[PDB]
Every structure is written in structure tokens, then in C-alpha cells.
Amino acid sequence: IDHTSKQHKRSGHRTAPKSDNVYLKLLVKLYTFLARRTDAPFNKVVLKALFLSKINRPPVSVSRIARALKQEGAANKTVVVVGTVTDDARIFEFPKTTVAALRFTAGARAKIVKAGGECITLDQLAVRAPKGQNTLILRGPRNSREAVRHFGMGPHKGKAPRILSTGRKFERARGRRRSKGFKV
Amino acid sequence: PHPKIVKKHTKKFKRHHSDRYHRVAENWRKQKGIDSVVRRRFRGNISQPKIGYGSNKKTKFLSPSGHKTFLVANVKDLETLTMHTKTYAAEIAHNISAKNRVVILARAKALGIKVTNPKGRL
Amino acid sequence: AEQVAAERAARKAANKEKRAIILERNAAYQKEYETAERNIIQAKRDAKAAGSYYVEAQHKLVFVVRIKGINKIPPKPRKVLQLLRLTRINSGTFVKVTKATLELLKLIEPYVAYGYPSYSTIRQLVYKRGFGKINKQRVPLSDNAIIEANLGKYGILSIDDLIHEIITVGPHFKQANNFLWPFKLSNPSGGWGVPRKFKHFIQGGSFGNREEFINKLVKSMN
Amino acid sequence: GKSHGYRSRTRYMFQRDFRKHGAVHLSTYLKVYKVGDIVDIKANGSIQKGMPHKFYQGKTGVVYNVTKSSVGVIINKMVGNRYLEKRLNLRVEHIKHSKCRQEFLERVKANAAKRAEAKAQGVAVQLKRQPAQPRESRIVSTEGNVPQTLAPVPYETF
Amino acid sequence: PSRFTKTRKHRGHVSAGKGRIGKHRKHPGGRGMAGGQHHHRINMDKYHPGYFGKVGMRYFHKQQAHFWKPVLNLDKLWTLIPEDKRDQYLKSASKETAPVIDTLAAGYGKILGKGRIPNVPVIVKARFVSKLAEEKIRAAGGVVELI
Amino acid sequence: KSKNHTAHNQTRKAHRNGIKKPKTYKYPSLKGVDPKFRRNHKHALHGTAKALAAAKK
Amino acid sequence: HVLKKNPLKNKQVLLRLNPYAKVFAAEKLGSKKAEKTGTKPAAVFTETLKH
RNA sequence: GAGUAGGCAGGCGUGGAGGUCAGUGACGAAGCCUAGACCGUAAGGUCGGGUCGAACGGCCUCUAGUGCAGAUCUUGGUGGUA
RNA sequence: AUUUUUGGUAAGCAGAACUGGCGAUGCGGGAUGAACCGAACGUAGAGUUAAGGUGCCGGAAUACACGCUCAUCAGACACCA
RNA sequence: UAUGCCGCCCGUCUUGAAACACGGACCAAGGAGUCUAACGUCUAUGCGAGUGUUUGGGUGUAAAACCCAUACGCGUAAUGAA
């Protein structure tokens, strides 16, 4: 019985949300059903993105939505954000759209409604698009969180030192310039 | 109806050296010694609890009677096993007075629920 | 909703025409084997009469069974036995004889017994110990529907069609052999003979290439 | 103490060769190296500039940079439990082309010729290579070859 | 929550998860940043390059209120005007109804030029500006009034 | 009093979870390549970009 | 499939898989003869065999 | 389907806390004793009998001075030697 | 610990190379033994074997077959005495 | 309880413990990874270009709950010794 691999190794993927939220579990229930029956690749993506954690569902901005509909041919699709849809006061023009999020911010809800658009849930979406007909699934940038600039620090990575004060006297002298000993 | 009940290990799992010393109780305790013959499992030492001994899931929590034991305090608690007489056996709690046992055994037989304890408390 | 003498009768009619294809195929393979023996036997007799010896074509199929435990196997043979899928003792696989395989058998010789598997022994193995890889989940065959589901892509539609694509090394040998789960044989019926197994067969041991005597061993182990 | 110098343990390998001393023959310099070309690494001890470490002697990499008297080679260096991307800077006498990759790059054109030909003819090409197949059934003829009955020899000194 | 701690899960096992050879002793390296140049050099030079030695010139009695100058980009400039009156300016402000953004009351020293503002006269009042800030405000058609 | 060095178990440790290839990307490391080839190559690629930006009509 | 029965006995799973099992049994193909009046011994093979 | 050091998960038990079972209880709470019984792989749980005499429990949660055979451990008591 | 191997008369000594083991490992065998052989282990039933044996202790032929050996210090199973 | 076979005394340091290595006569009770300031990772929750009521004020069925202004911390900009 010369085992090739690790015996009784877990898949290593979330099969449920560690969230104990009642309304998320009702939403997972709907999408576990649709994922099983529909046999449309969309429903498997949405089920997993519902299981995903706060660090892995970063907020998709309205400005990022406006950019994803700036694309040619994909201007009338429904914008599936699985996570928060945040506001961006940077842009001024916003088109008439329908966006299916978990949560909106009071600013994001104002801007999408004012353009003339429809703020959808995932169940309001599922009742109109069982197979995600004419959808555009988006994700916010994961590798922008402030913790990720310290991941795999060493010489000469150009990664952020974990520090609490940021001026001179704090981690610039020896080993950050050829003058004092060496550089990185 | 039930499959013929088997229990793979009937006799109790007494702690090692519970016989030898009085300070040591026979309440099972895993031998976490570096040289323990019980932990290392030498031919002739006691057997340890292993999940593999786990009773069949269709025969689990059934008494010899074939009824899952349900602790009952009062008539209110007995009156819940009414549509579950083939399934359960009412057992009056240890701290119930003789007069309250008179009432429960009266009601138990009136509904047709098997009881393991009284006895009538003579 | 009738669907009792329409759907049931339709797929029954489909089953009967399929068994009729399988019948004439198994009749074709019986004919293929019996004439192929007769030809080789007559060729040997033709040559003896001519006054000139006849070399039987080098065996192109070998049945490999791992006769060794799992403890104290060095990295080289160990990984070769992981590639032939002999991950436990009395595990059997098939291997098409090539240079890239004959040299693997030279490496793992001290951990296995192998030889030239007859038609009969192959038939008995795939009947009694026919297991398939389907969504890995090792599933017993028990029905030629399960073969022609997964291996119908390559043209094999039956147990006897699979046993054919092994016994006569086919263009879909790789597929048919890798589909078959590694045979889980038991220890032999009357033993090994052989007081000590882990010498080479020639010395009076058991391990290594036992040309035709694998058939006997394997049936005993079956 | 112990010696771990650059050219340490390299008596016999950076040695020149028997009756192949003296000058480098000019084909070495006239040879053209381009990026993506797989080249060997083998130092010429007679030339003591841009010479590789004894590790890289015997290795094969691929040219990544090309400059005046020199190339740049990428080699796979296993250290502990993982390979790294080791960039050498070698003068052109310490390298040569690999007939390894020359025999492949001509097989590609041989396959291209076989297929492009047999697309518009009677087809039985089988483009893949197969290993040494178990030899087919032959008749061996004993016409003036009546087998010689060999016997084993008795022992004798010298 | 003491009952979730692995201390509760450790009761019974001899060494309490700290091993039988390490023993868990008081201070087997020293007490905080000790031997940073000696036996913790590898961890200091990695992860904390630049810790040891001095760099640059000292500043005695450095009041952080001199160096205030908080910054506002042009992408965020229009967010200063309240949303009650915002859209009336952003649709035909146009010279004499050009809105007045006092960035010092908003609590910014400098204006920097990162964003694209809409083509509107947007009279900006800032203590400091970038070359590209005053470029883009004049381009859009406004002005920078220094205060 | 101690011992000094052994490479025993070091292979086993390495092979357990490890020996792994560096993954080989397309468009490789164009760093430590001839600086004047680079200086030019930039202008070549910028030229090809302009030529396809002209071709787009 | 609660039980793997065995093709080689039970006779039913042998007639299920391999319908040719009927024809083989009926015609007795496991007991085919079917010759000979050849018959071709050798010339030199026998002398090289004996020697 | 092994496992020291070690990690993680699922539970068992204790002192208190919020909620609930209109919970049990001088017709006997808790405690202790039991070559009686039943449940649980187990930590443990439940019941019968005795003694006893004033409180205590299930379940959903909160919290911790929360589980002992070893420390030439502490205090108190007890032995064999006798 | 087999194999390659340095120092050393040597070592159950000191130090290396590759691999396998003990450590952290129970089980069958070598009477006993950390490392040898065979095999790695949930709880049971049935069947078959490994190494090792089958006079008696002791489950199993005082089996068959060809030879050798007579010891007033017989000999008797690898590592291993 | 008898009988066949099996079974060295646990805990510990250890390459190696039944050890002619250490602690342990016996029993009850007590008895050892805690709290805190500041932080890394991962996760949950809220709100999200913001966020954080509770230093303080108002209020109160009164150390609770409820409400709240101006700041302030962190974030929304980096790089330089400057």
C-alpha cells in the first residue's frame, strides 16, 4: 500500500461559507440548487464566489463597472459583483445598467439609481437569468490589500518592511544604502 | 424491527494500572508515556478505544428492548412520545417523587409507552 | 404518459441489436485466435519438415505481479513500481513489451514476477477481477454497457472486445490497459513451491521473468 | 584548513587534452550564436577569461544574451529542493552547439516533409517514433549451417 | 474565551505542546532585540535591513505642525463641493457662475494633479499647487487663487 | 565531542515536498541583456505599435 | 450492483457478458480436433536433435 | 485507516453568568456507598437499592482561579516495618 | 545495517558517501534482543501465504530420495555470539 | 474462580530504560501556558473613501441602556539626509 499522495487530504477549498449569515445561507441554497440542475458554467462561479471570504471578495467600484461596460459588445450585460459594490466620486459619466451585488454602499446605490440603473440581489438576478444569460462577472483587485506588499520580503525583493514608524532612523541605515555597509 | 444487535467490544475500557493503584481511577485515560507498553500496543497488554469499535448506526442508542431511552420528568414530557411508542422507552428521572411516578406509570400504560424503571416504588 | 411499451420497448430493441453486434464480434475474435494458433503451430511444423528452425515472434505482452512488500524498496525500483501501478503486494498490471518497458522490468526484477500471459489466464482475470477506472472511483465491470460507455469512444463495446485489445496488443492497448484497474490478486492456492521466494526464478526462487509459468502462478493467485 | 577556491578540485578537467595543446582552431570563432540556441558549457583552460565554474563544466543551457567576445547562457541549478535560473557570461571558446537540438530541428522538417507529402497520396505515415519492438517471426535456414555442438571446457593453468 | 484556547486541549499531554527537548525555558536567546548584530543578524539583515547605524541629519525641536500640508488630487477636487449644489455647477457653471472650492477650509495645504477634472471653470483656492495642478485647472478653464 | 556534517536524509527532505522546475514564462527576463540592444528594441516595438495603430482603420 | 457475482460461474452473468458463451458450449469449441493426414516429420532436425 | 515531538478538528466533564423547560424536590434536593442494570469507540451519561436531609438540574448561549499519578510538589491524614 | 571508504593493531572506536531502517513501530520469525528477515497496524469472520519451520516441549511428515560423518571435547541455520 | 497461551513498572532525560539510571510507602484535597500594553497572519461582523458613539456632553427604569458636537488616530500619496 505504498501511498503515492497524502491519504485523507481535504480538497483544500471552501464547500460552505464560514459566515453563519442566515440570508447568505438562503442565497447559497438557491445557487447550490441552480449549480446542480442548470448545467450553465456561470452558476458554479457564483456558488464559489459566495463561499469566498472578506479578503477574497474585495469591493468592485462603480468606476470599474463603468470601465467593464466601456468594452465593445458588452455594453447591455448585467454586472454580477459577488461582494460589495463601492462608490467612486472620481468619475462623472455613468450609464444605465443592471448590477447584481451582495451589498451596495449608500453612495453606490445613489449613483447607479441616478444614472437610471437597477440594483439587483443574486436571487432577483437568478429569477431573470437562471443560466446567467447576458452577464458580466467582475472581481475587485486582490493584490492591492496593504498586507500583500510584505509577502515574501527578503533581499532583494523590493517588498515593504513590517514597521510601525516610517521616517528616517527607522530601517534605512545599514543594508539599505552602499554608504552604510551594503544595500539589501 | 431491527438487525440482530452486535457490540464489537462489550467489556469496559479500564485505564491501565487502575487495578494496581487506588490513586488511579479506571475512567479511561490515554497512556501518553514515552516507553508505555499500553500506548506502543505490545502483544498481551490491554486494548485502547479505537473508532473502529463504533457500534452499527442502525443498532446505535437502542436498548436490548430495541427502544431509544428518553429521560421523562413529568406527564407533559411523557405526552411527547405518543406517536413514537415503537421508537422510544420513557425512563422516569432519578429525582421524581413516588406520587409523581404513580401518575406517569398510569399515563404511560394509558398511551402504551414501555418504561424500564418503576417498579411502583413499593 | 404511457412510456412503458414505447421507451422500455425502444431501448430493449436497441439492447437486442447491440448484443447481435457483440455476438458476431465475439465469433470473429474466437475465429481470429483459433486460426492464429493453428498458423503458428503449422509454421513450426512447416519449418521442421523444411530442415530449418522457426523462431516464434518475441512475446509482445507481459503480465507483471508485485511479489514484494512495501518496506525497504530503494527510490529507483520504488518509483518504477509506482509507474506500473504495483503499489501493494500481489498487485497485477499488463505491459506491452518495448525497450522503454523491458528496461523497467530489468530495474524492478527483485520486487516482481512477470511472464507471457496466455489467452485463458487473461480471460479469467478480466472476468473475475475486471475493475475499471471511471471518475477514478474503481467500479466493477459486471456489465459490457459500462465498458462501451467509457471505451466505446475507441471502438471496444464488450468484455471480450477489451480482453481482445489486451491479448492481441492493439492500437488502443494503452487506453484499454490504463482503463483496467491494477488487479488485486491473492496469495497462490498451493503456495509458490520455492522454499524462499526472493531469489531469481532460474536459481530456484520466484522473482523475475518466468516465461510461460506466470499463467500457472496467476491462476493459483486468482 | 579546507580549500574552496574558484578553480579548486579542477586539475584534470581544465587540463587541455593529450596532443591538443596550444592554439584554438578558428571555426570556434567563425561559429554564430543567436538567442534561443541551446549550447554546451566546457571551459578551454588555455583561455582564462569568461571561463565557467567547474559546476557548469559539462552542463547544457540556452543562449539569452549575445555580445562582443561572449554569450549569456541560462542553466538550471538545483540547490536543496528547488532549481534557480543561473545566468552565466561566457567567452565563446568555453561553449559549443548541441547536436542534441540539431537532430531534433532536422526531424521537425523530416516530419513536415512526410506529412505535407502524404496528405495528397496513399497514407500510412505514423509520424511518432516507437521503441525497439519485439522481433517478428523469422525462419532460420540450416543450409550449410548445420549447428556446431559446443561443449564446456575443462580447467587448465595458463 | 479560555475554553477555545489550546491550553484546554493540551491538558493530559506531558509537555503542553512546547516539546520534550526544547523544554520551554525562560529566555534561550536573550530579552528582545538582543544579539541583533551577534546571533540574530540573519533575521535583522533580512526583514529589517537599515535597522543598525545612523542616516541623515538631526532636527532638534521638530514641531510636526510646520510640515502640515495635507494633499488633495484633482480626481477628488470636485468631491469638495456639496452634492446639494454640485450638478448645477457641473452642468453649465460657465464663467461668472464658476464655483469657488476653498481647499484650506476642507483641510488641505497642497493640491496635486493626478485626476482628470470635467471641462468646467472651477476657481480653486489653495495654499500650494503642483505645476500640473494649475495647468489642468487653467485647461479646464478655471484658476488657482493663492491664499 | 559532537559530529560535524552529514548529507543523510537531505535528499528525502528535498524530494518529500520539493524538487521543482522554475515554470519557464513566455517573454523571458530581458534584464542583463546587452543595454544597446534593449535601447534599440524599445524603439523597434514602439515603431511596430505605431504601425498597427496606423493599420487600424 | 450490490454484489459482484462472478462471470466464470453462476452461468447467468457468463451468458449476460459474452452471448457467444451459448454457441461455444453448444458447438463444443473447447474440444475442436480437427486433423491430420499430413504428415511431415523432418530430415536433418532429427539428427541435430539426437547427435 | 501505524505513529513520538508537533499541528488542526469534533466532542466529554467543572465553578459561575444570560435565556428557556409555567423543569425536579421534605410523599425527599445535593452529597456519598453499591461483585445491580442500560447507553456511549471514549471522555462520560442514565437508572434501581441504601444512607441522608435542603437544595438541584436539561437545553441554547456568555465567562473562567475549569479536569492530575508523578514535581526528593503543598497541607492533612494513614500505613508495612512492629 | 549491506556496499564504497579515511584514521587506527584494533574496537559494541573515531569520521565520511549513496540508500534503507530505529528514533517515532506494534505484528510473524531469528529462544531471548531498537536496528536483522517477512511484513507495517480501524473492529471482526472466512480463505491463502510471507520470513521461519513440521521428534517432544510446539501448531505442522519420527515425510520421501541420493550420499557423507562415529568424535574419551562430535555437529546442528545467515546478522550472532 | 480454574485452565491454554500471552503480559518486565509506571512517569522522565535519552541514539538506547525492565534496568545494577532518576521521582514515586499510601490516600484525600490544593497544584503549573494566565492577564495586560503593543503588534503579524488568518477568519467573522459592521460600515466602506472612508472609518472609529463611550476622553467628554446630553440622558437614564442609574456603573447598564439610549442619543450627540468638535476634534483626533488610521486610511485617502510617494520619495529624498534635507
UniProtKB/Swiss-Prot annotation, chain A:
PROSITE patterns: RIBOSOMAL_L18E
An example Gene Ontology CC term for this record: cytosolic large ribosomal subunit
Subcellular location: Cytoplasm
Pfam families: Ribosomal_L18 (PF17135)
Coiled coil: none
Keyword Transferase tagged: no
Tagged with keyword Transport: no
Protein name: Large ribosomal subunit protein eL18A
Organism: Saccharomyces cerevisiae (strain ATCC 204508 / S288c) (Baker's yeast)
Lineage, top ranks: Eukaryota, Fungi, Dikarya, Ascomycota, Saccharomycotina
GN (gene name): RPL18A
From Swiss-Prot, chain C:
GO cellular component annotations of the record: cytoplasm; cytosol; cytosolic large ribosomal subunit
InterPro entries listed in its UniProt record: Ribo_uL30_ferredoxin-like_sf (IPR036919), Ribosomal_uL30 (IPR039699), Ribosomal_uL30_CS (IPR018038), Ribosomal_uL30_euk (IPR005998), Ribosomal_uL30_euk_arc (IPR035808), Ribosomal_uL30_ferredoxin-like (IPR016082), Ribosomal_uL30_N_euk (IPR012988)
Cellular localization per UniProt: Cytoplasm
UniProt keyword annotation of Nucleus present: no
GO molecular function, one term: RNA binding
Main localization of the protein described in the UniProt heading: cytoplasm
GO biological process per UniProt: cytoplasmic translation; maturation of LSU-rRNA; maturation of LSU-rRNA from tricistronic rRNA transcript (SSU-rRNA, 5.8S rRNA, LSU-rRNA); ribosomal large subunit biogenesis
Keywords: Cytoplasm, Ribonucleoprotein, Ribosomal protein
Record family assignment: Belongs to the universal ribosomal protein uL30 family.
PANTHER family with a match to the protein in the record: 60S RIBOSOMAL PROTEIN L7, LARGE RIBOSOMAL SUBUNIT PROTEIN UL30
Function: Component of the ribosome, a large ribonucleoprotein complex responsible for the synthesis of proteins in the cell. The small ribosomal subunit (SSU) binds messenger RNAs (mRNAs) and translates the encoded message by selecting cognate aminoacyl-transfer RNA (tRNA) molecules. The large subunit (LSU) contains the ribosomal catalytic site termed the peptidyl transferase center (PTC), which catalyzes the formation of peptide bonds, thereby polymerizing the amino acids delivered by tRNAs into a polypeptide chain.
Protein name as it appears in the record: Large ribosomal subunit protein uL30A
UniProtKB/Swiss-Prot annotation, chain D:
Alphabetical UniProt keywords: Cytoplasm, Isopeptide bond, Ribonucleoprotein, Ribosomal protein, Ubl conjugation
GO cellular component: cytosol; cytosolic large ribosomal subunit
Pfam families: Ribosomal_L21e
InterPro entries: Ribosomal_eL21, Ribosomal_eL21_CS, Ribosomal_eL21_sf, Translation_prot_SH3-like_sf
Signal peptide: none
A GO biological process held by the record: cytoplasmic translation
Assembly notes: Component of the large ribosomal subunit (LSU). Mature yeast ribosomes consist of a small (40S) and a large (60S) subunit. The 40S small subunit contains 1 molecule of ribosomal RNA (18S rRNA) and 33 different proteins (encoded by 57 genes). The large 60S subunit contains 3 rRNA molecules (25S, 5.8S and 5S rRNA) and 46 different proteins (encoded by 81 genes).
Other comment: There are 2 genes for eL21 in yeast.
Function: Component of the ribosome, a large ribonucleoprotein complex responsible for the synthesis of proteins in the cell. The small ribosomal subunit (SSU) binds messenger RNAs (mRNAs) and translates the encoded message by selecting cognate aminoacyl-transfer RNA (tRNA) molecules. The large subunit (LSU) contains the ribosomal catalytic site termed the peptidyl transferase center (PTC), which catalyzes the formation of peptide bonds, thereby polymerizing the amino acids delivered by tRNAs into a polypeptide chain.
Cited PANTHER family: 60S RIBOSOMAL PROTEIN L21
Annotated family: Belongs to the eukaryotic ribosomal protein eL21 family.
Curated annotation (Swiss-Prot), chain E:
Keywords assigned: Cytoplasm, Isopeptide bond, Ribonucleoprotein, Ribosomal protein, Ubl conjugation
Domain of life, per lineage: Eukaryota
Statement: the UniProt record of this protein carries the keyword Cytoplasm: yes
Pfam family, one: Ribosomal_L27A
InterPro entries given in the database record: Ribosomal_uL15 (IPR030878), Ribosomal_uL15/eL18 (IPR021131), Ribosomal_uL15/eL18_sf (IPR036227), Ribosomal_uL15_CS (IPR001196)
GO cellular component, as recorded: cytoplasm; cytosol; cytosolic large ribosomal subunit; nucleus
UniProt function note: Component of the ribosome, a large ribonucleoprotein complex responsible for the synthesis of proteins in the cell. The small ribosomal subunit (SSU) binds messenger RNAs (mRNAs) and translates the encoded message by selecting cognate aminoacyl-transfer RNA (tRNA) molecules. The large subunit (LSU) contains the ribosomal catalytic site termed the peptidyl transferase center (PTC), which catalyzes the formation of peptide bonds, thereby polymerizing the amino acids delivered by tRNAs into a polypeptide chain.
HAMAP family hit by this protein: Ribosomal_uL15
The protein's assembly and partners: Component of the large ribosomal subunit (LSU). Mature yeast ribosomes consist of a small (40S) and a large (60S) subunit. The 40S small subunit contains 1 molecule of ribosomal RNA (18S rRNA) and 33 different proteins (encoded by 57 genes). The large 60S subunit contains 3 rRNA molecules (25S, 5.8S and 5S rRNA) and 46 different proteins (encoded by 81 genes).
Record protein name field: Large ribosomal subunit protein uL15
The encoding gene: RPL28
